Design an enzyme around this catalytic site. Structure first.
Site, PDB file in Angstrom:
ATOM      1  N   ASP A  18     -15.423 -35.686-103.936  1.00 39.34           N
ATOM      2  CA  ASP A  18     -16.871 -35.687-105.031  1.00 39.34           C
ATOM      3  C   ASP A  18     -17.017 -36.835-105.242  1.00 39.34           C
ATOM      4  O   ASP A  18     -16.778 -36.999-107.124  1.00 39.34           O
ATOM      5  CB  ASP A  18     -16.279 -34.406-105.979  1.00 39.34           C
ATOM      6  CG  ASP A  18     -17.213 -33.712-105.973  1.00 39.34           C
ATOM      7  OD1 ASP A  18     -18.722 -34.373-105.995  1.00 39.34           O
ATOM      8  OD2 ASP A  18     -17.952 -32.764-107.079  1.00 39.34           O
TER       9      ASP A  18
ATOM     10  N   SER B  96     -34.911 -43.301-103.337  1.00 35.23           N
ATOM     11  CA  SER B  96     -34.829 -43.113-101.223  1.00 35.23           C
ATOM     12  C   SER B  96     -36.472 -43.493-101.836  1.00 35.23           C
ATOM     13  O   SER B  96     -36.886 -43.552-102.631  1.00 35.23           O
ATOM     14  CB  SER B  96     -34.619 -41.869-100.869  1.00 35.23           C
ATOM     15  OG  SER B  96     -34.922 -41.971 -99.635  1.00 35.23           O
TER      16      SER B  96
END
Length: 330
Positions: A35, A199
Site C-alpha cells: 500500500d 497530473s
C-alpha cells in the site's frame, strides 16, 4: 541488493493485490497488500481477537527465533475506506522477493475491523508511503522500503500491476524490459506523507486532451481512480445511461455498455487506461447495473490515482533524497 516479487489480484475484479512476504525465522509467509498510501506493516497474528480471524494466515511471533517485542509500542490506523486495525509491535526479519530487512517493525493486530475479517485473502498490509505517516507510538517506525533503501542498488521500487493478471513489485532496480517507450518523471510533494504529484490533464476516449493540473496521490492500496467531480462527470457523460447513485455510493452504468478509455497526463506524456479497466462489474450478483472504476473525490479531500490508473502503467517510486515518480506505458 534487490528484490522482486509477484503480486496477484485477490479476485476477478482486481479489488486488491497480494504479495507473499516472509516474516521471522523460520519463515512464516503471509500474503500482504502493498500500500503506497500508508506506512504501517501490520499482520493478522496469534494475538488477533479470535472472532475477527476468518481464514487469514497469521504471524505467530512466539514461533520466530528472531522476533522481539518492541516494548511499550502500540499502533492504531484508520484507512480512507473506514476500515481500521490496531495492536502491538515486534521487530523481526522480513523478506520480500529475496530482499531482506532485519529489525523491521512488524505490527501485530489485536483488533481488525469487519472489512479485514471478511477478506480471507489479505493477511495484512505493507505500507510504502513515507515513514512520517507510520502510526507506531511512542516511537515512530520506518517502512520496509525506508529500512532497505541504503542497501538497495538504487533507492527505488516499482509497481507493475496487472489487469486481471499477476504483476510485479521490484525493489532496487528498474526492469527496462517491463515497459515500452520511456519513463516520464514528475515531481513529488512529501508534505502529507504520500507519493503526491500533479497530473497535467486528461482526455475521455478519443476526445481532446484538457490541460489542467490535478494534484493527487499514487496509491496502490486504493482500488479505484478518484478525481474531481468535473472530470468524473465529463467521463460518465460519454456512457449512455450512466448516473451517480447516492444509494449505491457512486457512478453506475449499464452492464451492456462499452466504456471509453481515460487518459491522464504525466508531464508531456500520456497514460491510457482502457475502458475495460473501468468496469467493476454488477453492483450485486445478477444485477445489470455495473459499478464504475472512476469516481468522484469530492468529500475525500484528495484525488487518488489508485489501481485503475496505476495498472495501466509501469510506475517508479524514486526514493532518492528528492523523491520523484516515474510513469511509462507498457
Amino acid at each position: 541488493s534487490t528484490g522482486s516479487a509477484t503480486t496477484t489480484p485477490i479476485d476477478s475484479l482486481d479489488d486488491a493485490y497480494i504479495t507473499p512476504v516472509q516474516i521471522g525465522t523460520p519463515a512464516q509467509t503471509l500474503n500482504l497488500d502493498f500500500d503506497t498510501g500508508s506506512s504501517d506493516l501490520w499482520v493478522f497474528s496469534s494475538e488477533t481477537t479470535a472472532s475477527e480471524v476468518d481464514g487469514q494466515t497469521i504471524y505467530t511471533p512466539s514461533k520466530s527465533t528472531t522476533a522481539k517485542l518492541l516494548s511499550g509500542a502500540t499502533w492504531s490506523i484508520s484507512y480512507g475506506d473506514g476500515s481500521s486495525s490496531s495492536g502491538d509491535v515486534y521487530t523481526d526479519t522480513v523478506s520480500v522477493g529475496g530482499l531482506t530487512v532485519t529489525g523491521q517493525a512488524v505490527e501485530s493486530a489485536k483488533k481488525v475491523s469487519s472489512s479485514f475479517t471478511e477478506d480471507s485473502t489479505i493477511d495484512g498490509l505493507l505500507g510504502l508511503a513515507f515513514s512520517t505517516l507510520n502510526t507506531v507510538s511512542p516511537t515512530q517506525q520506518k517502512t520496509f522500503f525506508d529500512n532497505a533503501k541504503a542497501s538497495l542498488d538504487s533507492p527505488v521500487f516499482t509497481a507493475d500491476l496487472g489487469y486481471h493478471a499477476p504483476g510485479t513489485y521490484n525493489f532496487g532496480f528498474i526492469d527496462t524490459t517491463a515497459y515500452t517507450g520511456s519513463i516520464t518523471y514528475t515531481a513529488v510533494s512529501t508534505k502529507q506523507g504520500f507519493w503526491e504529484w500533479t497530473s497535467t490533464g486528461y482526455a475521455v476516449g478519443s476526445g481532446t486532451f484538457k490541460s489542467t493540473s490535478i494534484d493527487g496521490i499514487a496509491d496502490t492500496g486504493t482500488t479505484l481512480l478518484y478525481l474531481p467531480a468535473t472530470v468524473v462527470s465529463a467521463y460518465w457523460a460519454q456512457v449512455s445511461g450512466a448516473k451517480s447513485s447516492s444509494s449505491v455510493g457512486g457512478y453506475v452504468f449499464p452492464c451492456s455498455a462499452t466504456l471509453p478509455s481515460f487518459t491522464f497526463g504525466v508531464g508531456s506524456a500520456r497514460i491510457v487506461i482502457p475502458g475495460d479497466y473501468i468496469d467493476f462489474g454488477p453492483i450485486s450478483t445478477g444485477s445489470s447495473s455495473c459499478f464504475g472504476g472512476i469516481q468522484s473525490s469530492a468529500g475525500i479531500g484528495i484525488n487518488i490515482f489508485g489501481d485503475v490508473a496505476l495498472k495501466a502503467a509501469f510506475v517508479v517510486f524514486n526514493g532518492a533524497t528528492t523523491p520523484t515518480l516515474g510513469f511509462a506505458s507498457k
